Design a protein around this ligand. Structure first.
Ligand SMILES: Nc1ncnc2c1ncn2[C@@H]1O[C@H](COP(=O)(O)OP(=O)(O)OC[C@H]2O[C@H](O)[C@H](O)[C@@H]2O)[C@@H](O)[C@H]1O
Length: 195
């Protein structure tokens, strides 16, 4: 695992960018890049189920059978099986559509806000969370726009906002060099140089 960028976002919360495998990255909560059915058939989603255990897939199915599909911009929280985290926050990013860039961007923003609301207000005991570049793989969201949107939404959601949570670290994580590089560049553009 390798940390390529870090910066205090607020006096309490540090943002960092990592090259790592989310299946072995130890944090309190890992964010999955899910679809609306929580059918974990490819990408990060499949990797999490394969490493954490099929129970993650069962809990996901039961969630949707009870509460309905998870719309883009929304979350569902499950257990994490054998993974080195306490929960999986399944976040549904938009599928990229060239004809609706503005709507897609908004859905990605909303997904980040939903993650942050869970961590800050619903489970105030989360100290660390790791977040992927939602929608930028299988969902084809352009990588630079994706990473910039994520970092800016995190910034604007937290800077100058009193809260009551134990959150100390947000990790932006990929196992692919170009995505790590895009997160690093977005972080530097929005927050300044690593410190
Ligand atoms: N093990 C991993 N560790 C770290 N980063 C990872 C890992 N696996 C993937 N990534 C990064 O994870 C990021 C997101 O990649 P994607 O998983 O394609 O998600 P999406 O939101 O675009 O597509 C969701 C759909 O794909 C699935 O079929 C779901 O079931 C949905 O149908 C990329 O930056 C990858 O580098």
């Amino acid at each position: 695992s390798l940390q390529v960028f870090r910066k205090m976002l607020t006096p309490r919360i540090e943002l960092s960018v990592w090259k790592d495998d989310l299946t072995t990255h130890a944090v309190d909560a890992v964010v999955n890049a899910a679809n609306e059915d929580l059918l974990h058939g490819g990408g990060l989603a499949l990797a999490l189920v394969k490493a954490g255990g099929f129970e993650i897939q069962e809990e996901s199915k039961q969630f949707v059978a009870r509460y309905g599909k998870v719309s883009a911009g929304e979350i569902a929280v499950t257990g994490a099986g054998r993974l080195p985290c306490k929960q999986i926050i399944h976040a549904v990013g938009p599928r990229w559509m060239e004809w609706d860039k503005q709507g897609c961007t908004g859905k990605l923003q909303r997904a980040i806000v939903s993650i942050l609301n869970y961590v800050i207000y619903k489970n105030t005991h989360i100290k660390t969370v790791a977040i992927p570049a939602l929608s930028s793989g299988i969902f084809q969201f352009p990588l630079n726009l994706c990473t910039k949107t994520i970092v800016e939404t995190i910034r604007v959601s937290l800077q100058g906002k009193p809260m009551m949570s134990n959150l100390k670290e947000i990790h932006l994580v990929s196992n692919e060099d170009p995505t790590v590089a895009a997160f690093k560049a977005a972080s530097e553009f929005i927050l300044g140089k690593s410190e």
